Design a protein around this ligand. Structure first.
Ligand code: HEM
Length: 390
């Protein structure tokens, strides 16, 4: 039985195991990092189907009987009450709608531009301080930028950015240790201090939105509020960071690609970002669902209670949908992909993520015309270094 995570030989490639499994069945039995059996979906059509099929949810009817995936913060095992999941999910999407609305995204887009400029300043200063040496674009740009965007999204006071990033770094390990466990308490406590700050002076940010939800709905507790804020950090930081890093690696690993983008960044950026999203593959597992009844799909009998891991990474390389699927081709004319999922759980931050990526790459290649480059994905798995010079 195949055992996740699958191995690969270089950062830009996808693990070869997925195509081996896909060629035999769209849905295959695998073992998770936690050692339990799950179905892995590797084809585009079946992944799309599971994403859109309400018979698969995040909850499990009898969670004690369920396969575990890992010990990660999210996408790790059963989540939420089975009887109430759809209602709770609808309530979550509604409460976060203001935060991702167009006026809020207009403001955040301006802050993203400014934050990008400041990160590129740090990259240039590191290069000037160590002339002749590569500098790590991940350290100065890919890793910090999306967590600073999360600060602006949540409403973290400017003076606290370092404090916040320190707490997040300690909970981001997901290692179950004693430090990480006390860091989660300190982090949730910090979320609750900020909630009181927003009650004093409401702002156009997520924490203010969530205290407004509480004043109209006493069932939404401080723990619910701090859990939601914590979950946006997990969902929105390293995901985005790895696409900045890996997208830079795609563009720099073939000079012709770099030069095409650099020659017309404003014209090329939308389609370039979509191809980065299609090809970047960093998952150790997949997007987690449990069957809420027996479901037959593509000749596989998925029984009630079974774990299903949807591999968007693998779905996005299905050769029946994307010809030459391992080739980086920003001109792919239909380039709908499942990097953000689809259906009811489609990434609520997709537009924010696209705004981050679409802002960074034109600024990066305008600022640094000479820019050039100098084995398994972890559930927790950090962002690869991208050493560059110019
Ligand atoms: C920009 C910051 C981001 C934020 C704040 C964010 C937030 C979220 C949230 C709250 C969800 C859950 C939606 C739901 O269950 O209704 C979600 C789902 C999702 N996100 Fe994001 N996200 C961000 C960026 C990204 C990036 C860059 C990617 C990868 C290219 C990504 C991939 C996904 C996927 C695949 C799902 C679906 C998970 C599932 O079906 O279980 N997200 N995101």
């Amino acid at each position: 039985t195949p055992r996740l995570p699958f191995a690969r030989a270089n950062a830009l490639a996808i693990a070869p195991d997925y195509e081996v499994l896909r060629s035999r069945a769209p849905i295959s039995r695998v073992l998770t990092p936690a050692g339990d059996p799950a179905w892995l979906v590797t084809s585009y059509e079946e992944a799309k189907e599971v994403f859109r099929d309400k018979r698969f949810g995040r909850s499990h009817p009898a969670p004690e009987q369920a396969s575990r995936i890992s010990n990660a913060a999210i996408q790790d095992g059963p989540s939420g009450d089975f009887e109430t999941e759809e209602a709770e999910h609808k309530r979550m999407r509604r409460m976060l709608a203001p935060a991702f609305s167009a006026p809020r995204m207009r403001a955040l887009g301006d802050r993203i531009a400014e934050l990008t400029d400041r990160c590129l300043d740090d990259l240039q200063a590191a290069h000037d301080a160590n002339p002749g040496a590569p500098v790590d674009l991940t350290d100065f740009l890919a890793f910090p930028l999306p967590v600073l965007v999360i600060c602006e999204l949540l409403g973290v006071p400017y003076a606290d950015r370092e404090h916040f990033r320190g707490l997040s770094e300690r909970i981001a390990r997901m290692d179950g240790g004693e430090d990480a466990q006390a860091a989660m308490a300190e982090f949730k406590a910090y979320m609750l201090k900020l909630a009181e700050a927003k009650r004093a002076d409401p702002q156009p940010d997520v924490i203010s939105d969530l205290v407004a939800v509480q004043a109209d709905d006493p069932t939404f507790t401080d723990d619910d509020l701090s859990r939601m804020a914590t979950g946006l950090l997990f969902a929105g930081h390293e995901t985005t960071s790895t696409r900045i890093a890996m997208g830079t690696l795609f563009l720099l690993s073939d000079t012709a690609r770099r030069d095409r983008f650099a020659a017309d960044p404003d014209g090329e950026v939308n389609q370039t970002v979509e191809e980065i999203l299609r090809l970047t593959a960093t998952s150790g597992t997949g997007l987690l669902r449990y069957a809420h009844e027996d479901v037959e799909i593509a000749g596989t009998r998925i029984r009630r209670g079974d774990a299903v891991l949807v591999s968007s990474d693998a779905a996005n390389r299905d050769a029946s949908v994307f010809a030459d699927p391992d080739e980086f081709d920003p001109g792919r004319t239909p380039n709908v992909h499942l990097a953000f999922g689809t259906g009811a759980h489609v990434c609520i931050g997709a537009n924010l993520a696209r705004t981050e990526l679409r802002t960074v790459f034109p600024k990066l290649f305008r600022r640094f015309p000479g820019l050039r480059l100098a084995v398994r994905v972890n559930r927790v798995g950090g962002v690869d270094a991208v050493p560059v010079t110019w």
